[PDB]
Amino acid sequence: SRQEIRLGLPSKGRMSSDTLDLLKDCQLSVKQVNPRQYVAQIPQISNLEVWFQRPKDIVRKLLSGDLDLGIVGLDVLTEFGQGNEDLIVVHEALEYGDCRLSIAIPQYGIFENVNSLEELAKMPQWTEDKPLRVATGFTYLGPKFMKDNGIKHVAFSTADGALEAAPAMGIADAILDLVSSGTTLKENNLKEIEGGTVLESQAALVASRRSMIGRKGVLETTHEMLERLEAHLRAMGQFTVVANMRGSSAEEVAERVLSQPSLAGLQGPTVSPVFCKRSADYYAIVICVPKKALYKSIQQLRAIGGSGVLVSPLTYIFDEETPRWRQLLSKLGL
Amino acid sequence: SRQEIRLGLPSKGRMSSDTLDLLKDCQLSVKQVNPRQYVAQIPQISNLEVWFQRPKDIVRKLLSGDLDLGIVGLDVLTEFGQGNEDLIVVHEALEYGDCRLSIAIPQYGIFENVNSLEELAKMPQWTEDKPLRVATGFTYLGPKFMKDNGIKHVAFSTADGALEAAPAMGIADAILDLVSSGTTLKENNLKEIEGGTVLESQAALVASRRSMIGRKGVLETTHEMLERLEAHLRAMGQFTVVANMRGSSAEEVAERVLSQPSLAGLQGPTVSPVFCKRSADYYAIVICVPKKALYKSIQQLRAIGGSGVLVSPLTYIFDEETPRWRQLLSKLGL
Amino acid sequence: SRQEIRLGLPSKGRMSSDTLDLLKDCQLSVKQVNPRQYVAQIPQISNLEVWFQRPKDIVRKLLSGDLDLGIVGLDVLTEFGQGNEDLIVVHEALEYGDCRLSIAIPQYGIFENVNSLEELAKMPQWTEDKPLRVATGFTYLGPKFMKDNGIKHVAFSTADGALEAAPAMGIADAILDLVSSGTTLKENNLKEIEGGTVLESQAALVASRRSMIGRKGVLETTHEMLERLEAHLRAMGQFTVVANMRGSSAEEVAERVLSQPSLAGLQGPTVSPVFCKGKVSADYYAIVICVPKKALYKSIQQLRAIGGSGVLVSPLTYIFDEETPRWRQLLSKLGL
Amino acid sequence: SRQEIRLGLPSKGRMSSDTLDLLKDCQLSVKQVNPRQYVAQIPQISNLEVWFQRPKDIVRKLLSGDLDLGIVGLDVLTEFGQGNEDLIVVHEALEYGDCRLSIAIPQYGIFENVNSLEELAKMPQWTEDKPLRVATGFTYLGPKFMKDNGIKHVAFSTADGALEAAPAMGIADAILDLVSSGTTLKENNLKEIEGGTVLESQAALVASRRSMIGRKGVLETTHEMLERLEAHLRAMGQFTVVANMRGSSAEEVAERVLSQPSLAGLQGPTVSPVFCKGKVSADYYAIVICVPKKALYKSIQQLRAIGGSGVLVSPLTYIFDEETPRWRQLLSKLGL
Amino acid sequence: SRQEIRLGLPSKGRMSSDTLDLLKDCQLSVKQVNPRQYVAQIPQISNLEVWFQRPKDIVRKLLSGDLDLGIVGLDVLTEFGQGNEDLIVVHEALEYGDCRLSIAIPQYGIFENVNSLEELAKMPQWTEDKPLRVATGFTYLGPKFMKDNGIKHVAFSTADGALEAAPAMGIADAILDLVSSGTTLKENNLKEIEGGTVLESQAALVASRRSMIGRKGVLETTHEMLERLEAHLRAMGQFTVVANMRGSSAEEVAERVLSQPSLAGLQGPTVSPVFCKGKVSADYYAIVICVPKKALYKSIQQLRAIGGSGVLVSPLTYIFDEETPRWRQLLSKLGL
Amino acid sequence: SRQEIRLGLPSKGRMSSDTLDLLKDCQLSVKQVNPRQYVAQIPQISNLEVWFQRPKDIVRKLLSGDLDLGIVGLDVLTEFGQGNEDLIVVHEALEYGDCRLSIAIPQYGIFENVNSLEELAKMPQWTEDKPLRVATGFTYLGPKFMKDNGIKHVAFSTADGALEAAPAMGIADAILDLVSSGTTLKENNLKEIEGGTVLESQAALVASRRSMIGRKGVLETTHEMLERLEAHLRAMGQFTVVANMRGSSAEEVAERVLSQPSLAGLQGPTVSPVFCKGKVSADYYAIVICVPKKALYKSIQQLRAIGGSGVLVSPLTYIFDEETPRWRQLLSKLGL
Ligand SMILES: [Cl-]
Ligand SMILES: [Cl-]
Ligand SMILES: [Cl-]
Ligand SMILES: [Cl-]
Ligand SMILES: [Cl-]
Ligand SMILES: [Cl-]
């Protein structure tokens, strides 16, 4: 029917450039013969045509069938997708565009001892006649969230930006809007509440189910992208560690390391001998440790007769088969 | 309920900042006690509350009666206002936001020798079964424009941006979108056509009719706002001129320039005499000429014996009663 | 030793560039042959040599006899000058550098029902044993303000910056610092107090008494600078207005505007005839006045009430008065 | 066989952007439908076609006769024009692109007591065999300059950028190049000398002689262009000044002003009466003259000497003379 | 005389900044005590003086013997060098400064059906009476290119900038100039043609033959520069890969890998056992190859075919080969 | 009293941003919930509370016991700490904030043949009557420096900026100030001299002795901080190198490498066989060592003389020694 595999990418903003940067880091650089046209290509994967588009246009064109793949925030996906079974998240966490969609209410007067959705719902002020008015851009997700949390008496007004104005303006009581830093809303005398968070968004690789099950090339490129993306993301959270351990043999050392359950797993330790002039004073284990627990791991393996540790970076980590690929095939099935 | 008169200003972009620049030039500067909020005041006019909003919501809030006045582009006004007669344009030409909503088609294929709206409506390819597809943001105004120029075989897809893409992407045959500088649509191999323009927009002051009639202070402040805005805008296209004519009296000279009908009128000339000694060589006429016709007016005055001319700037020009104020009272039924 | 008149200008910040802007608007532009040296010149005044320094050092050098004139905030002058009689404020208000030195305390703690400086003095917790701890850069001015307000029980810690966080940090109970934008100290949960303002500051022209009497040309150039500065500052608050009025003579019209006391008190109106054309002459009369910017629209409405038609508003660049009070006041401060 | 009138404008740098700002200020705004082409239009003048070019290409294209008019620095005009009689400076002073082409020599070495052209010319070192080596961009003007002053023993290595290096590098003894700020060559241990500057440049309006005589509308638009530029430029050097004079009559006060010769020379003063009220009398009269900006303060002194009270200074956008002296000079250069 | 070894580096623009970044990436960082001067130095190599010059002055000074080494574009080398045998290209591809000198012609005109240089040479419009006019900065290389392709009906004009104008301006038929991104000449209705590329350029390391042969240190420092540069540039195209193979022995694994000819060319694999968690030991074996970045994914797939499992990719900073063929080729050019 | 551990970090300038960069690279990133406060956290360490402060106030609060740890320059530590023995420098060398406090002297006048501190002392001009006047912000250190080097008659004037002016405006004979780039004082015609440097400075980790001994948590987090920081700083001066050697056996090549004393010491080499091809196996062996960056090329020459060929240089992000010399030094400073 159509020859090329079409990837939609954000066109404007920091979301656009962060996406292009992530792609360059995975050897999926975008190239553009005509810089102020909206068509481009990733040469790494021939037959992959990219189309710069606004996040919701990407969701719209995935549904309408004019795109096969896309990168968008989970906010825009769940709002305009509306739970359509054709939209499949391939990677749910590209580690940018971090924000959450949450409820904000005034600190001020009638809301002062209210720090929970339970306690907000508990108030006597709201029956069907005078309901809890709440301004949002998420005209789909707001209703669904309130129904799903058993609150019947709410009325949503829509605004296309600057929602913080609504409570000061008197046009609503609460709001439902994106937050990432938390700056704006204390400065407009608003506050979040426990269980106010509707979802935590970030950039995601998304695909049409019909596109992937339909054409082998679409399934194959999605697989390549997934692997290249997670290989990059995994590596960004890992170091390779080279520690010098005391011991008579290589295999003796290997055990002591392999005994410690806290000590970081990978595929497994390698151990080669560290020479000196007299022969074989230390043994060099080569493991692969998460950045979060680097110092802990250094401390642990000092207790097990370790000495000099050499931390070096990783570019990529390709696991033989990703849990996400399994999960994706499972999401495709029905 | 509400006590205050409310002016909605654009919150974002060049539109926002140009608006604030204009208001400062007319002694209507906005002052913000809390810069991170959306509330503000214009000190010059007491009881006048400024809410920064998106242009779309300025229109909506004017209709929902949550704003009284607003500054907004005619594109956004006619699109989301939908001709609603509660919305009255007080000033239609604040001289920024200059752009036009017009149709653009490709220039390559079947359109190579199609340079008119009727020329493309004439084409056979478009039928009730497979019609002319046009991508637009202006979901309301497009259909309306096609009807009013007799084009029945048309279908409208929506998009949120990057409409230039759609012909190349093959999701549409033409687009209906804003154009100012005009570069963007050569860069995507598109062209405007004869009579393809739907409207020419710029920033405009508008007012709720229900607010003007039934809320105190609204018609008052609208009058002040209108006179101040116009006084500035008028003065921007004028110079005061002081030219030295040759003659034997003030009234002799006065009659010469007053009998030049091409000469630029103000309310009228003013003569004082220019002194010397060998007493009263030239006579100094002071008129007020449009900037557009300066050098012409200087040549004209040289034909009437004029020598030295001094051009100087004007800050404001207040006519006794503006035609725009008259036209408002006329639109109110008066 | 020295043979040139020296003007100290601020070296750093908005304060520096605001100063340089103001001097350019008054035809006193600073030229600089070596953009990152500290010496410079104002050419419009022969033998005037600029030296860029920190505000603090401008006060020091005025006192030390190394500068003759300086532009400096009143906060800095009073703190580092300490009411020294050699330092005279020539112009107390150049309408930039606006801020105030005021006391701030936490909203949260025991200070919820405390919004007056004597309410703060009233509180029982403080005594010579364990006094009111207060952080400030203004280590001279703080003590003086509270001695002068009869508050004996205070201890002054001294910081050089980031004072808004001393209460959070438990190093002091209140602070004494500058406020201008207003935002910073509500964001650190502090508040201002009634009577807690020590002084209003802004950029000011100061001069050395020793210099004015003792160095040739200083007083002459102080005079010129004062006059140009004030003319510009007065001019920035005025428009020239040309209203067209209805009358059968020049003087008839001149009365109706002069018998309106609400109408602006310039030096006085100028009436001249507006000619017009089958063959007629001289309908309106054009009065020219000099109205404050604040009350423009008011004064337009006033003139329309007495038969006014078209108003043309135009800018003023300088307004030189015959003799400013400030010049007389300076000579009186000098005993001249 | 070209049919439009063609103005060459600098395509690059601050030269380019100052040129466009000047033409905007004179209602000769440049409009460009395709910003990434080099062709453009000035709408105010019908038939006028701008071409953005590098200054030396502007000169080369005026000579080859692909342009009619151009704006370039007198530096590049003189270098590449070479005294060609087809080029005529219509305006030699647009008040931007200010720089001088001059000789710079080392401070440090055998030059410490050499502060003059003749002083360095007289020195015994330089001879037919080993000459005075001079690094320069200006390959035409260097030889011409030093022949015209009489320095036989000189050799001209050419370089096209970064000339201050040449002395320090050893490739030459002196440079000939552009200076403005005077900063750069203190930092490379060099100095200018007396009688060492070849030329003082700024932006200039230049016209082809063949174009003015030969092509329809060139001489006509050169006139318009000159008169609008000159009007703007004159107005930037002037103010209008209105002063209040105590007097009996308006001819009496005029006599007092006109017989002060050092006071400014606008075509002439205007006196109108100032009405005041007592009773509606008309005590003083309002003189309005137009005064050079540099001379504003003296002119106010000079007016207060003649019982002048309060002065209002205000700006001028343009001043058109009846016939600008430059137009008389241009016609003179054309053999009229 | 002169003691020091001199490297010319571009002074201006992006060429300058990219050259300085590359040298920093090779531990050949330039240090500059006086940023306003043109002299500087690289510490890592002793007695090496850096001089910032415009790229054509670099080529000019290499010829005159005032520089020993230089980094410039092959365009400016060939245009100003003119095949001079004193100039030798040591490294012809530093992977920045990429552009191509090519002929461009109109799209519209009569030129729509010519997309080849011989197809425009086939056009019979051009004779000795009225030849093919072509404007260019490259006055030496233009004729020499046209001569060598057999087109004697051409006359060259010279412009120094804004050459895309010359067709629309009417002053020439085609142009010869630099292209990289490709956008600028679409915007002026021009197109390239097949075979019309005169030269593909990039930044190159160049040396004077007289300097290498007859100056102490040059050949030595050239050797070091060449190797440090090429080591960095090679490592930018490579990764190191640590893949886990299923095997019964280390040498069994090594065989399976080396039996793949399509698999990467490291000097060889380094296999080591990977230990496993009751008392189990040593199931996987870890090879380390060194694959090009181009072929990474392919090579992972190739490895997974041979029972490869987890792969770890990590960066290289430098790859020093034993002998660089570029170094051997240099010595060859010195008759050595 | 107070429950958190408190680290002072610079609040303004490059000093502040370079500090936060270093802390980011050592997994000690600062997280600020409220950017417009001066309080912050490092999440990596439990109960650690960052306070942004001016460097002077970090020293002042370390003495007053309101902070436990700080990062400041050694310039600020010795001026404001004044050898106080509660203040202990934990790491003296964070490789940013590089400058030196040193005397500068005019080059022009009586000081032309004065390039030494003793030559300056020796000068007859200075006496108890009229001393050597020297301008400085370092009110404590200047006098102490002069008394330590027996300069008998010296008056010290204070300034808080723009000291380079002080000679030019005749208020001082010399200055004592920070110098980093060294450019600022050629511009203002000053020079440093032999023995001018009072101290060389850079950013340093500093701890309160009472806080280490008395407040538990501190010593533990100091250990952690020191180890992470030095681990980073050491890794910035190393590469890992993987040369491969021709050899018959594995400890044969280990020998030849360990016999070279000039070759890179780490803890020692590792070596594994490199396999390569009817059927051939195990030609050369891959040595892996850890060379300092400054000595990289030297080490590669060295390894080639031992029959080495290919070298693969790669980056290290941290090097953790088992126990650091600076930690031992810290303990011994706690009488331990
Ligand atoms: Cl936020
Ligand atoms: Cl557009
Ligand atoms: Cl503040
Ligand atoms: Cl210069
Ligand atoms: Cl290009
Ligand atoms: Cl410095």
mmCIF file with all atom_site columns, C-alpha atoms in Angstrom, chain B residues 83-142:
data_model
loop_
_atom_site.group_PDB
_atom_site.id
_atom_site.type_symbol
_atom_site.label_atom_id
_atom_site.label_alt_id
_atom_site.label_comp_id
_atom_site.label_asym_id
_atom_site.label_entity_id
_atom_site.label_seq_id
_atom_site.pdbx_PDB_ins_code
_atom_site.Cartn_x
_atom_site.Cartn_y
_atom_site.Cartn_z
_atom_site.occupancy
_atom_site.B_iso_or_equiv
_atom_site.pdbx_formal_charge
_atom_site.auth_seq_id
_atom_site.auth_comp_id
_atom_site.auth_asym_id
_atom_site.auth_atom_id
_atom_site.pdbx_PDB_model_num
ATOM 1  C CA . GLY B 1 83  ? -19.835 36.454 13.947  1.00 0.00 ? 83  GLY B CA 1
ATOM 2  C CA . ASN B 1 84  ? -21.552 36.560 17.375  1.00 0.00 ? 84  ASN B CA 1
ATOM 3  C CA . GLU B 1 85  ? -22.992 40.097 17.579  1.00 0.00 ? 85  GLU B CA 1
ATOM 4  C CA . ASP B 1 86  ? -22.232 40.528 21.350  1.00 0.00 ? 86  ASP B CA 1
ATOM 5  C CA . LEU B 1 87  ? -18.602 41.055 20.228  1.00 0.00 ? 87  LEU B CA 1
ATOM 6  C CA . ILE B 1 88  ? -17.946 44.573 18.885  1.00 0.00 ? 88  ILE B CA 1
ATOM 7  C CA . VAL B 1 89  ? -14.615 45.602 17.328  1.00 0.00 ? 89  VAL B CA 1
ATOM 8  C CA . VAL B 1 90  ? -13.853 49.044 18.808  1.00 0.00 ? 90  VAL B CA 1
ATOM 9  C CA . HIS B 1 91  ? -10.583 49.526 16.930  1.00 0.00 ? 91  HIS B CA 1
ATOM 10 C CA . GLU B 1 92  ? -9.802  47.212 14.017  1.00 0.00 ? 92  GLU B CA 1
ATOM 11 C CA . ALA B 1 93  ? -6.242  48.311 13.213  1.00 0.00 ? 93  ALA B CA 1
ATOM 12 C CA . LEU B 1 94  ? -3.745  48.721 16.052  1.00 0.00 ? 94  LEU B CA 1
ATOM 13 C CA . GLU B 1 95  ? -0.949  48.320 13.434  1.00 0.00 ? 95  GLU B CA 1
ATOM 14 C CA . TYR B 1 96  ? 0.675   45.091 14.683  1.00 0.00 ? 96  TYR B CA 1
ATOM 15 C CA . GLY B 1 97  ? -0.178  41.393 14.260  1.00 0.00 ? 97  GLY B CA 1
ATOM 16 C CA . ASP B 1 98  ? -0.218  42.000 10.513  1.00 0.00 ? 98  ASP B CA 1
ATOM 17 C CA . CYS B 1 99  ? -0.962  38.771 8.700   1.00 0.00 ? 99  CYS B CA 1
ATOM 18 C CA . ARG B 1 100 ? -3.528  37.274 6.347   1.00 0.00 ? 100 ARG B CA 1
ATOM 19 C CA . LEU B 1 101 ? -5.477  34.052 6.265   1.00 0.00 ? 101 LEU B CA 1
ATOM 20 C CA . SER B 1 102 ? -5.283  32.841 2.663   1.00 0.00 ? 102 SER B CA 1
ATOM 21 C CA . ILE B 1 103 ? -5.359  29.643 0.606   1.00 0.00 ? 103 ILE B CA 1
ATOM 22 C CA . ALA B 1 104 ? -2.139  28.085 -0.662  1.00 0.00 ? 104 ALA B CA 1
ATOM 23 C CA . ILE B 1 105 ? -1.769  25.321 -3.257  1.00 0.00 ? 105 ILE B CA 1
ATOM 24 C CA . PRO B 1 106 ? 1.258   23.598 -4.791  1.00 0.00 ? 106 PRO B CA 1
ATOM 25 C CA . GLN B 1 107 ? 2.984   25.045 -7.882  1.00 0.00 ? 107 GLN B CA 1
ATOM 26 C CA . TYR B 1 108 ? 4.339   21.872 -9.527  1.00 0.00 ? 108 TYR B CA 1
ATOM 27 C CA . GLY B 1 109 ? 1.849   19.232 -10.659 1.00 0.00 ? 109 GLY B CA 1
ATOM 28 C CA . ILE B 1 110 ? -1.683  19.786 -11.934 1.00 0.00 ? 110 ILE B CA 1
ATOM 29 C CA . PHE B 1 111 ? -1.642  23.328 -10.433 1.00 0.00 ? 111 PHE B CA 1
ATOM 30 C CA . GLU B 1 112 ? 1.269   24.740 -12.509 1.00 0.00 ? 112 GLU B CA 1
ATOM 31 C CA . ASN B 1 113 ? -1.082  27.006 -14.487 1.00 0.00 ? 113 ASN B CA 1
ATOM 32 C CA . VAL B 1 114 ? -3.713  27.505 -11.744 1.00 0.00 ? 114 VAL B CA 1
ATOM 33 C CA . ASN B 1 115 ? -3.334  31.056 -10.360 1.00 0.00 ? 115 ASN B CA 1
ATOM 34 C CA . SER B 1 116 ? -6.887  31.904 -9.189  1.00 0.00 ? 116 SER B CA 1
ATOM 35 C CA . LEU B 1 117 ? -9.571  30.637 -6.780  1.00 0.00 ? 117 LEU B CA 1
ATOM 36 C CA . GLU B 1 118 ? -12.114 30.202 -9.579  1.00 0.00 ? 118 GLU B CA 1
ATOM 37 C CA . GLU B 1 119 ? -9.369  28.665 -11.818 1.00 0.00 ? 119 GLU B CA 1
ATOM 38 C CA . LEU B 1 120 ? -8.971  25.865 -9.219  1.00 0.00 ? 120 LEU B CA 1
ATOM 39 C CA . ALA B 1 121 ? -12.736 25.569 -8.561  1.00 0.00 ? 121 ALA B CA 1
ATOM 40 C CA . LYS B 1 122 ? -13.058 25.155 -12.379 1.00 0.00 ? 122 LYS B CA 1
ATOM 41 C CA . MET B 1 123 ? -10.790 22.041 -12.355 1.00 0.00 ? 123 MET B CA 1
ATOM 42 C CA . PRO B 1 124 ? -12.577 18.702 -13.084 1.00 0.00 ? 124 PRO B CA 1
ATOM 43 C CA . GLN B 1 125 ? -10.669 16.482 -10.577 1.00 0.00 ? 125 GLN B CA 1
ATOM 44 C CA . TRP B 1 126 ? -12.876 17.489 -7.630  1.00 0.00 ? 126 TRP B CA 1
ATOM 45 C CA . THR B 1 127 ? -16.115 15.612 -7.217  1.00 0.00 ? 127 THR B CA 1
ATOM 46 C CA . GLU B 1 128 ? -18.572 14.880 -4.379  1.00 0.00 ? 128 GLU B CA 1
ATOM 47 C CA . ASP B 1 129 ? -17.070 11.339 -4.196  1.00 0.00 ? 129 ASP B CA 1
ATOM 48 C CA . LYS B 1 130 ? -13.389 12.411 -3.965  1.00 0.00 ? 130 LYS B CA 1
ATOM 49 C CA . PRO B 1 131 ? -13.362 16.179 -3.201  1.00 0.00 ? 131 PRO B CA 1
ATOM 50 C CA . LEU B 1 132 ? -10.741 18.911 -2.743  1.00 0.00 ? 132 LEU B CA 1
ATOM 51 C CA . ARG B 1 133 ? -9.079  18.201 0.617   1.00 0.00 ? 133 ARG B CA 1
ATOM 52 C CA . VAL B 1 134 ? -7.731  21.305 2.449   1.00 0.00 ? 134 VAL B CA 1
ATOM 53 C CA . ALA B 1 135 ? -5.782  21.242 5.724   1.00 0.00 ? 135 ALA B CA 1
ATOM 54 C CA . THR B 1 136 ? -6.519  24.181 8.019   1.00 0.00 ? 136 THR B CA 1
ATOM 55 C CA . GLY B 1 137 ? -6.442  25.316 11.621  1.00 0.00 ? 137 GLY B CA 1
ATOM 56 C CA . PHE B 1 138 ? -9.469  27.485 10.853  1.00 0.00 ? 138 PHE B CA 1
ATOM 57 C CA . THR B 1 139 ? -12.141 24.795 11.070  1.00 0.00 ? 139 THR B CA 1
ATOM 58 C CA . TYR B 1 140 ? -15.005 27.341 11.200  1.00 0.00 ? 140 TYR B CA 1
ATOM 59 C CA . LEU B 1 141 ? -13.833 29.943 8.642   1.00 0.00 ? 141 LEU B CA 1
ATOM 60 C CA . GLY B 1 142 ? -12.753 27.550 5.873   1.00 0.00 ? 142 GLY B CA 1
#
